[PDB]
Amino acid sequence: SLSDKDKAAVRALWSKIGKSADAIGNDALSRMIVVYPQTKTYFSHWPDVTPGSPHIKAHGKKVMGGIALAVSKIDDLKTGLMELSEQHAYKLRVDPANFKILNHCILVVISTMFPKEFTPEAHVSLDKFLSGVALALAERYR
Amino acid sequence: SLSDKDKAAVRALWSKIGKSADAIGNDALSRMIVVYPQTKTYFSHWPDVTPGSPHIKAHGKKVMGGIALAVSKIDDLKTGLMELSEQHAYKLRVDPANFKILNHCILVVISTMFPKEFTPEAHVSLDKFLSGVALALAERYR
Amino acid sequence: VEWTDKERSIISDIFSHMDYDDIGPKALSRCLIVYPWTQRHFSGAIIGNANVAAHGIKVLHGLDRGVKNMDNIAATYADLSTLHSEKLHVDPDNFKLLSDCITIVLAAKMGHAFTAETQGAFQKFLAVVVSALGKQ
Amino acid sequence: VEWTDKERSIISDIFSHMDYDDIGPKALSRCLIVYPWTQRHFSGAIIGNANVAAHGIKVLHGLDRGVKNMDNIAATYADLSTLHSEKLHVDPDNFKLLSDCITIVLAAKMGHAFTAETQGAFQKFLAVVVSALGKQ
Ligand code: HEM
Ligand code: HEM
Ligand code: HEM
Ligand code: HEM
């Protein structure tokens, strides 16, 4: 669970990368789909699912918007992401094993775009934060 | 996180197997050490580390006592297991990846001893409970 | 992977003494109940569902194939891998979960006969099969 | 494992363009800081520690060995496996964690040149090496 040091580290990092949220979302989803083929099946209803695709570009914004929400509800992710959880579990039926995969792609993306900002001290708090998000999202599965 | 249905399922199961706690602890630790060799290193200070060993028999009681404690602090594991966490992280320096391994051995043990009681409905709540214990124990690691 | 002869013997013994029609349905049912998200691959209670039972039985006949080709496992499951992967869309993590339920159900049937050593050879066998199924 | 030629080429390119003395120390340091429990294997700040650096460099020279024997990886690491396993007592999970840090550090150095395709071949290569090291 996140300490005061972790909360400020994330707010601090986020004030730096937040402006590029759309770009991060787009690149993360693209990587996930290319590197982890088992994830394509959830977006197969889109006609075009390639790095450039406007559908991916479009969904990339929604996902990082999920992160932005989590950042503002960082004191209670369980409660803050309850609905997103219900949605992925019962409506979209996304296998829960994939939350950690996307988190890792986001970390890779943030690292290619902000090599200077993503220090090891920032990495550990963000990683703890993203695990919190994965745990919060898996909440309504069983 | 555990619902009222899960809490009663665990209290119910525990009122059935609690009496055999010592035996479960002994057999679980033995299995873990045999099936997952990477775990022996933490108990190498004992002269005898085999299924029969009195050192294993002795520690088996302490571990299931950890479970019994968790069962009574089931409303707040994070707080209830804080000290056990500090102990494994800083004093014994047990790699955190092993908590899930021991949990799985305990589940196997409970299944060989109480095939009738360990129904799938009991299994899911106990499994959610043991993940809670693993999460609570990993708390002070970083 | 490398197999000792003691391992080869245990796994072989485990399977000849196993009643597939009983272990099969129990393991799949338990997996669908403990890890609820696997139920979607069967949307078309759970313990009494004949379709779940039939597939439960097929899993054991499939693992049986692996027991008869312990030194050529990856090749023995190429067809099944592509099928569950490309045509059924089963997440590779689902194999690990189903694997643990087979272990727990077998454990409940064999009782004290499911020694640590027996658990070890059985888990290593399922591990190799899981790698092959979550590959193609 | 099976390797396409495109994969073989990417991994090979990645390594010749990599400066081991820079990537090595950064990846191990980051692992010791993000996953603190790995620090115990080095109890004898972290970013400037020469012992951590020396081992960071050795990891890259070791992975290098794997690049030159991509079709015989398991055999190439038997010695290292027994060493980290039996004599150093490094938990097998620690390899997965260190692996992710190498990826993230390499990602930060290559920037936009670390395409999804490049990430894919690199992760598959580390995965195979991790299986061999967490085996013996
Ligand atoms: C970083 C964690 C994640 C966050 C914050 C997140 C957030 C969201 C949000 C905000 C929506 C839009 C809700 C709506 O439909 O109105 C959504 C939809 C969706 N998500 Fe996620 N998600 C995450 C991870 C995943 C993963 C790992 C997958 C599967 C590989 C996934 C698959 C989907 C699908 C298929 C949809 C519906 C797509 C569509 O618009 O047609 N999500 N998600
Ligand atoms: C089911 C989760 C676990 C619980 C509830 C638990 C509980 C305990 C308790 C109550 C103690 C005794 C405290 C004392 O020393 O006064 C202890 C000690 C210890 N635990 Fe754990 N433990 C768990 C998992 C693990 C795992 C997975 C490992 C490593 C494979 C581990 C390794 C140790 C060691 C090495 C000691 C000190 C042994 C000794 O007495 O010399 N524990 N644990
Ligand atoms: C432990 C390894 C497994 C084995 C050996 C196995 C084996 C099989 C076999 C032999 C078939 C019949 C193929 C055919 O008719 O051509 C099949 C079908 C299928 N499997 Fe699996 N399977 C396994 C795991 C899983 C898992 C974890 C799921 C998802 C919970 C799954 C879902 C399905 C579905 C939906 C079908 C098609 C329906 C049916 O024939 O009953 N399988 N499997
Ligand atoms: C990613 C794969 C890894 C490779 C290729 C690797 C490689 C090596 C090599 C080549 C040596 C020197 C062996 C000798 O002198 O005979 C070594 C030593 C050692 N490794 Fe690793 N290693 C890896 C991962 C790890 C991890 C994750 C840890 C624990 C955080 C670790 C801890 C050690 C220790 C404590 C030593 C001995 C001290 C030293 O020579 O600096 N290694 N490793």
Side-chain angles (χ1 to χ4, degrees):
Chain A
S1 78
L2 304 177
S3 58
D4 289 343
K5 190 188 183 181
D6 288 326
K7 288 174 176 183
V10 172
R11 288 186 196 116
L13 178 60
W14 191 252
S15 77
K16 245 144 291 193
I17 65 179
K19 65 181 183 308
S20 305
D22 292 350
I24 293 165
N26 177 59
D27 186 355
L29 281 180
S30 301
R31 290 176 177 275
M32 184 187 77
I33 273 160
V34 170
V35 180
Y36 305 92
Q38 72 260 46
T39 55
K40 292 177 194 172
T41 189
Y42 302 103
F43 311 97
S44 71
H45 52 294
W46 296 339
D48 182 24
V49 193
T50 51
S53 171
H55 294 285
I56 287 171
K57 242 170 183 58
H59 191 62
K61 303 180 70 171
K62 291 193 292 184
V63 171
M64 291 314 287
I67 302 308
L69 173 68
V71 170
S72 72
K73 305 289 192 167
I74 199 175
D75 292 309
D76 189 317
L77 295 178
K78 177 173 154 44
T79 302
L81 303 178
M82 196 65 78
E83 286 195 70
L84 273 173
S85 182
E86 187 78 331
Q87 173 154 32
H88 287 84
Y90 304 136
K91 184 209 190 71
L92 317 165
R93 306 207 93 288
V94 166
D95 190 286
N98 305 120
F99 294 124
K100 63 182 188 299
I101 291 182
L102 182 53
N103 281 168
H104 171 65
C105 292
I106 289 171
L107 290 177
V108 163
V109 174
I110 292 178
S111 181
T112 66
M113 293 179 184
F114 308 86
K116 179 270 204 313
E117 296 59 40
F118 203 57
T119 60
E121 305 70 43
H123 183 168
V124 58
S125 299
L126 182 61
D127 186 50
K128 287 178 74 186
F129 169 70
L130 297 180
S131 296
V133 167
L135 250 349
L137 289 178
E139 185 68 33
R140 303 290 269 76
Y141 280 78
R142 61 171 184 169
Chain B
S1 78
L2 304 177
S3 58
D4 289 343
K5 190 188 183 181
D6 288 326
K7 288 174 176 183
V10 172
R11 288 186 196 116
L13 178 60
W14 191 252
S15 77
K16 245 144 291 193
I17 65 179
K19 65 181 183 308
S20 305
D22 292 350
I24 293 165
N26 177 59
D27 186 355
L29 281 180
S30 301
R31 290 176 177 275
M32 184 187 77
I33 273 160
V34 170
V35 180
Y36 305 92
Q38 72 260 46
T39 55
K40 292 177 194 172
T41 189
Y42 302 103
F43 311 97
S44 71
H45 52 294
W46 296 339
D48 182 24
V49 193
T50 51
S53 171
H55 294 285
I56 287 171
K57 242 170 183 58
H59 191 62
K61 303 180 70 171
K62 291 193 292 184
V63 171
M64 291 314 287
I67 302 308
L69 173 68
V71 170
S72 72
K73 305 289 192 167
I74 199 175
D75 292 309
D76 189 317
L77 295 178
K78 177 173 154 44
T79 302
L81 303 178
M82 196 65 78
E83 286 195 70
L84 273 173
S85 182
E86 187 78 331
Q87 173 154 32
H88 287 84
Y90 304 136
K91 184 209 190 71
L92 317 165
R93 306 207 93 288
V94 166
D95 190 286
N98 305 120
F99 294 124
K100 63 182 188 299
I101 291 182
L102 182 53
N103 281 168
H104 171 65
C105 292
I106 289 171
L107 290 177
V108 163
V109 174
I110 292 178
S111 181
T112 66
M113 293 179 184
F114 308 86
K116 179 270 204 313
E117 296 59 40
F118 203 57
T119 60
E121 305 70 43
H123 183 168
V124 58
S125 299
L126 182 61
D127 186 50
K128 287 178 74 186
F129 169 70
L130 297 180
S131 296
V133 167
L135 250 349
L137 289 178
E139 185 68 33
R140 303 290 269 76
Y141 280 78
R142 61 171 184 169
Chain C
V1 304
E2 209 66 340
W3 305 99
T4 74
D5 280 6
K6 162 61 74 176
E7 292 172 319
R8 291 172 177 283
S9 164
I10 300 170
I11 292 166
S12 167
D13 171 24
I14 281 169
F15 278 83
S16 63
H17 294 194
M18 193 184 295
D19 172 353
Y20 297 178
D21 291 14
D22 181 75
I23 297 300
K26 295 184 171 188
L28 190 58
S29 290
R30 182 167 292 258
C31 181
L32 295 206
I33 297 178
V34 180
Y35 304 110
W37 50 95
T38 55
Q39 281 174 38
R40 71 170 187 157
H41 304 282
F42 297 90
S43 297
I46 288 163
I47 294 180
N49 182 303
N51 300 308
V52 162
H55 182 259
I57 289 161
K58 291 180 178 164
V59 164
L60 259 29
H61 282 99
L63 295 188
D64 181 298
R65 190 194 292 169
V67 175
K68 297 175 183 178
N69 299 309
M70 288 196 69
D71 293 286
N72 191 50
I73 293 172
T76 300
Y77 294 109
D79 73 312
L80 288 174
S81 180
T82 301
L83 174 76
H84 289 79
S85 164
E86 181 56 353
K87 177 188 167 181
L88 265 32
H89 304 306
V90 171
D91 192 274
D93 190 67
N94 294 4
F95 292 117
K96 203 275 179 299
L97 305 181
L98 169 61
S99 184
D100 284 336
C101 295
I102 299 175
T103 296
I104 282 162
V105 161
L106 191 50
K109 188 193 193 188
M110 291 182 68
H112 293 313
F114 197 67
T115 66
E117 185 177 56
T118 297
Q119 181 187 344
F122 193 63
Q123 288 192 190
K124 182 183 175 179
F125 176 66
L126 294 190
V128 180
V129 173
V130 160
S131 289
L133 283 166
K135 197 187 67 175
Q136 302 292 307
Chain D
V1 304
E2 209 66 340
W3 305 99
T4 74
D5 280 6
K6 162 61 74 176
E7 292 172 319
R8 291 172 177 283
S9 164
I10 300 170
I11 292 166
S12 167
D13 171 24
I14 281 169
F15 278 83
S16 63
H17 294 194
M18 193 184 295
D19 172 353
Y20 297 178
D21 291 14
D22 181 75
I23 297 300
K26 295 184 171 188
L28 190 58
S29 290
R30 182 167 292 258
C31 181
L32 295 206
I33 297 178
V34 180
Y35 304 110
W37 50 95
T38 55
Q39 281 174 38
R40 71 170 187 157
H41 304 282
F42 297 90
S43 297
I46 288 163
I47 294 180
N49 182 303
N51 300 308
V52 162
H55 182 259
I57 289 161
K58 291 180 178 164
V59 164
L60 259 29
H61 282 99
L63 295 188
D64 181 298
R65 190 194 292 169
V67 175
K68 297 175 183 178
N69 299 309
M70 288 196 69
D71 293 286
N72 191 50
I73 293 172
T76 300
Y77 294 109
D79 73 312
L80 288 174
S81 180
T82 301
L83 174 76
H84 289 79
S85 164
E86 181 56 353
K87 177 188 167 181
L88 265 32
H89 304 306
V90 171
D91 192 274
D93 190 67
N94 294 4
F95 292 117
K96 203 275 179 299
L97 305 181
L98 169 61
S99 184
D100 284 336
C101 295
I102 299 175
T103 296
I104 282 162
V105 161
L106 191 50
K109 188 193 193 188
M110 291 182 68
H112 293 313
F114 197 67
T115 66
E117 185 177 56
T118 297
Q119 181 187 344
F122 193 63
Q123 288 192 190
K124 182 183 175 179
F125 176 66
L126 294 190
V128 180
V129 173
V130 160
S131 289
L133 283 166
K135 197 187 67 175
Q136 302 292 307

